[PDB]
Design a protein around this nucleic acid. Sequence first.
RNA 1: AAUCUA
Lengths: 624, 624, 623
Amino acid sequence: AVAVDLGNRKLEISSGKLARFADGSAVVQSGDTAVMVTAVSKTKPSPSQFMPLVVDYRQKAAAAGRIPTNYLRREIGTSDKEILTSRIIDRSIRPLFPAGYFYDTQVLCNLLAVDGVNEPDVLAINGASVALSLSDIPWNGPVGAVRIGIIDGEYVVNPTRKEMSSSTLNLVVAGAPKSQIVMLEASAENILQQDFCHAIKVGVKYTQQIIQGIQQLVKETGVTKRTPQKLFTPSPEIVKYTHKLAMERLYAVFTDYEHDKVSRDEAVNKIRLDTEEQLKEKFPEADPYEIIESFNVVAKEVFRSIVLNEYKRCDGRDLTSLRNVSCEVDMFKTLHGSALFQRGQTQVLCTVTFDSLESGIKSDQVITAINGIKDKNFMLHYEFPPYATNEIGKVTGLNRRELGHGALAEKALYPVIPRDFPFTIRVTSEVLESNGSSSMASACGGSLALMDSGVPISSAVAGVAIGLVTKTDPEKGEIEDYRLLTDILGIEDYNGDMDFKIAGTNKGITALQADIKLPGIPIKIVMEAIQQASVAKKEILQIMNKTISKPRASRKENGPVVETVQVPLSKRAKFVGPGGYNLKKLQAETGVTISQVDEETFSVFAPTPSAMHEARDFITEICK
Amino acid sequence: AVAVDLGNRKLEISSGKLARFADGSAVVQSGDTAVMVTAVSKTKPSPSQFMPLVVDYRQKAAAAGRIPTNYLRREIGTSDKEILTSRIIDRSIRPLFPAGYFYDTQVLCNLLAVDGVNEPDVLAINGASVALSLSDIPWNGPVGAVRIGIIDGEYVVNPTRKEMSSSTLNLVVAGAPKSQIVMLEASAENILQQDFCHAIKVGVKYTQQIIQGIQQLVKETGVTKRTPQKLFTPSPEIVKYTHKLAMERLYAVFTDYEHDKVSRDEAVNKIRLDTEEQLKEKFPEADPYEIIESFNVVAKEVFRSIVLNEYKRCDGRDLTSLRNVSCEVDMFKTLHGSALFQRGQTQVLCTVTFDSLESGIKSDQVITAINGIKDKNFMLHYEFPPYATNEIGKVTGLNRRELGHGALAEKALYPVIPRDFPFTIRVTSEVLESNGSSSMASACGGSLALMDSGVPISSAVAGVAIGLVTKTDPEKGEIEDYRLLTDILGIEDYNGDMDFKIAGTNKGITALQADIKLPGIPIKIVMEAIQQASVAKKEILQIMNKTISKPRASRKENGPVVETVQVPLSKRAKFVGPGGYNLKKLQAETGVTISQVDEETFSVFAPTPSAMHEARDFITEICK
Amino acid sequence: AVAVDLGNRKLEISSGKLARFADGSAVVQSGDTAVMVTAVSKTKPSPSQFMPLVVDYRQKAAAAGRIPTNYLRREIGTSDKEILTSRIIDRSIRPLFPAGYFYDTQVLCNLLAVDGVNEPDVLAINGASVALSLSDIPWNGPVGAVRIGIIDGEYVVNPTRKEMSSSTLNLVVAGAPKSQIVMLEASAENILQQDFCHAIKVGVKYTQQIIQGIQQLVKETGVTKRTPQKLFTPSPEIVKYTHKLAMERLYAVFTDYEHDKVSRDEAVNKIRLDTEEQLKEKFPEADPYEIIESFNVVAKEVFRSIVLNEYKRCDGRDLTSLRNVSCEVDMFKTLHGSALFQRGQTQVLCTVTFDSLESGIKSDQVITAINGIKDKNFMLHYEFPPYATNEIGKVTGLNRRELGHGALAEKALYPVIPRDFPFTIRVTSEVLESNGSSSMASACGGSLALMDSGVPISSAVAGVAIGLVTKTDPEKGEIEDYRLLTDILGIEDYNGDMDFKIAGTNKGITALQADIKLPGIPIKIVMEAIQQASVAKKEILQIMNKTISKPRASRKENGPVVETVQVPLSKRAKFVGPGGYNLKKLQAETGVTISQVDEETFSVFAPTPSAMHEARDFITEIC
RNA sequence: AAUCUA
């Protein structure tokens, strides 16, 4: 039992009592909230040629969570917040795993107790760190996670639920030893850049104390690490031979500025098919995947050497230039709001739909209605159809990537959404084409569609992704020099080190999500990435303002309307019907929903004036 | 863009703007309704030994303006209407794919906008044709698709939502060039054969106009088709050798009239096992699938040659004779209605259950799973259990074929269902044995069960499946000679050219679904198949009428009962309970449904008189 | 058609009219309830290397066949009673399949009609026996299945639904020929052991009558069984050679009493890896699965010979000795009740949560009827997370084992739960570690957590699992001698013959689930297993009484509270809001549930007193 | 998905 003091907060780490059969287990307690995290890793390599790591953060009970009704419903039973927490934990621990660790690994978080004051999500990230640190699973260095908020101008570490409701910043920092950053996930209320960057510095300082406490527990326990039967990394001899074969061909392809996404990928694949043939004859004993990964290592190295040495990218841009940006509005008459945002080869269609407040946050069943509430009656639904990348995939159910991307785009637009709007605002973003940051494209497209729809937002929101390419000597592991790329392509995210998504208005930062593929990056690099994104964001907002700069004076005339119709008491029985049968039937044939607000008056919501005409006829004929 | 004029309707076809990464994309607009359809086909051969083709039609109710109803505020699962539309689109485009195209292919329909006037389902079929035509996917000539209605005796092309509700015919025709028909799918309010037949030729004329417009768009934007790695068809010299080995044995098996379904299949399989081992020796280098498919082609040719040359079928029937039909009602005492319909070796058990009216208004707003209500309170649930074919299969959901078969039988019996019935009518059809058109047997058994249950249907409904065997030119492809088969077996559907399922009253037609496997059939064959089915339907109805000819004078004694119970204002709180808890608990353990009618009246629906005795006893003690 | 008489009840069994394409089919009718069961078995062996039998029991309607639900199955699925009934049917017919019958088999039950009087679950078990008996699927003798209930001290065979509500015992017996017992599944209202044992004897007698009726119909039909392409039992030549190689090594491992679960399994796998390599050289032509299964046979045989010959278990204790039992309560402050129960290397964490009574209903007529409503507002949710065995598995959803084990643990604790409790009682049992009877440990842990939470249960409930090792005649098939083991380990469960899970208080039996892996066992062995378990339950109940012997005088100070707020008619519209908007908004921002009592009263349920305070502020400010 | 050192 090791206690770590974080200002006025107390963190307690324990192990050896619960779940002794798991490879690693830990209990993290703050106040009266305890989280038990377990780590299991199979010793037999997985058939899949990557690192299979699954994080499942499960809430035992909100009030009384009980159980989903049936088995297939139970598969749906995973809530949105549990999915988001699992992705944060996964992003915090994935970079620290060794290369070639192709072994099935599962990290499970079980909420032993929740006091309703201390948040269990932060404790779950630390619990994952302690469980892996104490386990025999090879995992490079412990990590510490804290939350930073700003309450009346003061920075608070791990704020309570009450403080978070009055905070202008919701930043979660995961830090590696010697003051590195592994995960950044923020949601700010359009706060200044200087205020934002100071909170990152404060958060990193706290995570070092947690790492110190975890290191003390690890030493006192006497942790021994397993030796995996094989680490799946290409041998240096095969890799340097692949470099000799395809250095010039890949260099010419990556310096060809006439390529598009498909043309470039086909050109690289054409070189690959030639290289794999020659590689197999030279090394017949090599594993079939070892041939594949050797080309990927060589191609990635050549791709990064061009930007490092020449400061020019594969499409002829320099380190700070954006791709072509085009915007459109009100492309379809019937939609309440519409926009088509294009950025390079990334194309996103955004639609705004208004609906009644009751039919937007209120569900029939109270038990499932919890956690489905929206503060401003605002939600964003993000779709990534398989045809966006010319692929075939199932379209049943939202996966975790679409869920996280929708939450990130909703976080960016949330601060500018006005309060007390008469209707629930639902923004739907569909990625028609994907060659880069579709989620930040959904923030810009969603901003345009909101202004077109006529909802009076405070300011336009633009997002951008910042890449990173570093040169690190293996003998030291430190970063010598690096480049920051603005508005990265898909290949730059794939062959880079960080996909630093950052969104906000021209005068502040609204959301941030840094996905670092390196085992930590210095504090200095993150600040420069934020500043570099500030310049790019202002340029994007200039292009957006040309298409539309202010919200329309009013909503479209074919939009929803909210009004009241008087129903007398003597007529209440026939109008509503037995058990609300008549009202339920009307809401089915026509989209009009009728809600009772007074013993004599009923509020009728009509999604369209034409939909009003069918409903108004329905009430009049029943009225007789 | 290309504009196609269809009477007073205008069709707009466009491409090259949205979703440019897919192999083919198209936007089809009618009025303010726009639908985007994309087609993606993999270039590597599928491991499956058939053509994997998936069509998904998603409503995306953001176009309508009322997208969210559930607590997740996003669509969960697939609606019944969405599944049926995906089936219609799939049937329109599947026959036009070349033989041996064993490549994964997905067609996705995104509803960009809907105006509530023009139906997007018809535009989705045309969009699938344009997307496939402009793509590089190997696909035959363009397919036009229109919906033909009859309003005040006038034939209307692509009727609006308002006209579709006043139409006595809902016919969808998909046409190929040269006025061929690839898909027929209709439901009529017991209309005459002459009126039904005229609408078909009117619809085929309009689909040629669409084809001409699509061909112009293909000419304007240059379309080059890909060359697949290979088309998986058996080699001609392999097929002709299999003919030498197994022509005589298959000829004897197919001319043996003492075979049943299982014995005929075993006899053919015995020849297949002996032939395959000889084929492998003759062609050691041949693909293992090429050996399997070569026998299926030879067997299909021998099976069809007997019908064409000798006009005699594999079971001894002629082209017009029906199978033995046995009807029998009143299966069990407690069922409200029941019937056991036997048609050859196809056995179907149909049950009728009377539910409350309140159980039929389940929409997505009330319950997340089920959306929509039936115009008449009547639905048909169709089951195809795995033991019907002596097979093992998952008994879970996600069965597209069962949903499609149930919809076909439901609309076959829909026109005769009486209006303003006091109870919801639920017809459950189970296939106990299957050797043919079990779906059509669900209409015959369903009407027998409806009459046995006491429902005053207007007239009896009988269904039948008409097969087809053609002898086309090996080069021209023109249909030279053909035979229409009445009440086909399973092997006649598998080895045939279409499964022409048409049901109706002795005086009219109520439903039709033509599943053509040929790349279009002449309009003359469709008309002759309709006439041939009219004669067969009369014979089936005569057999059915002997078992039962009119509905029973009253419902069964153990049928549902509805009457009110009066409670005082003082006892309302105790009777209803806190938040309706007492009513929901009594109605969950006793089985009755209680709905409030007035301030003193409660309507109780009891499925059985015994159930009302239990509910009455519970009311008495509560009222004490 | 054959009619079998069971006292005042009548069974009608017929075949040959419905679904003639299936391998086996039968209709079993009692009263106006008819159940149709089919059996399909593939003739091509499956590559699963075990018996792939799946039993699916489906009902057209819920609440005694009064609410149609077949149409809703597409998006909703199968309810838990359908899962439990399928499990019971599977356990009644699985042990009678021949060894090595690795062929896909599916048994499906279709409720043709239900009258709301005769329960179709019992008829489904008999229909599975008749359908398999008349089929060509290789299967052993027929099984008769009856239900026995005690109504006013009288034993009733196949009691009606109305009778079952007034019964103190719900016992389902599946019997084999020669009065053998195949499946036992009982829940009792804390009845005496002697009354429980007599009902088993009565049930076995009634199942013999059904078997004689089924055998008559089989003879009349003239059933001929198929010859399977292969039976996948390991060859005796390979088994005898594996014995020579691993008899001595496995003997030392199983007599090493310092082993724990992981070390013992690792030591066994060490021998398996070496022996399986030597086996391949001796029989290169042997099936690779045959090599695997031959070692499993030898290891099981050596494991059993130690118990029979020496009367010592693999961990050093004797046949009637329990494992080390550790109990602990009140570990987390905010939990309404908690308990950590340890039994050997089995660890179970049990939590008690109080909710409002309205949480039992699901707000929908069909959905609430599908899952039912618990009689005493009490249910137990049982989880078996994959880290309990150091395994990786899909964590979303509850499989068949988790649902059945949770129902067994809920059955044990149900008789002692008090009535008229102001709150809904939810018990969550999580298996942190598993090495034995986790479900039985969930009854003990749940009893500790209920007393700690302050629930006034009538008596503490303890459970245990009894194993069985028999020396059966190679040809005669009779049990020469046997040993009953108390509180078996997982390895003794794996290599044993029975999972006799049995729970009860200090003065009666509350639940029982016998999982027999043999093709029937004599009723004398069953009687001794019940007696041996009563001794073990006494010792367990004494240990748990030291940790906590009586429920706490009151619930925890941070538990739920139900209050009442009075609102005027003028302020009702503002308080409830448009269409109950404000009430639902509060229910999502604080977790409190407000329900209308009358025109003036609203009842507020708050999980914590703090939630009551903040919600009370909202009511005052909104008014 | 069933069974499964649960």
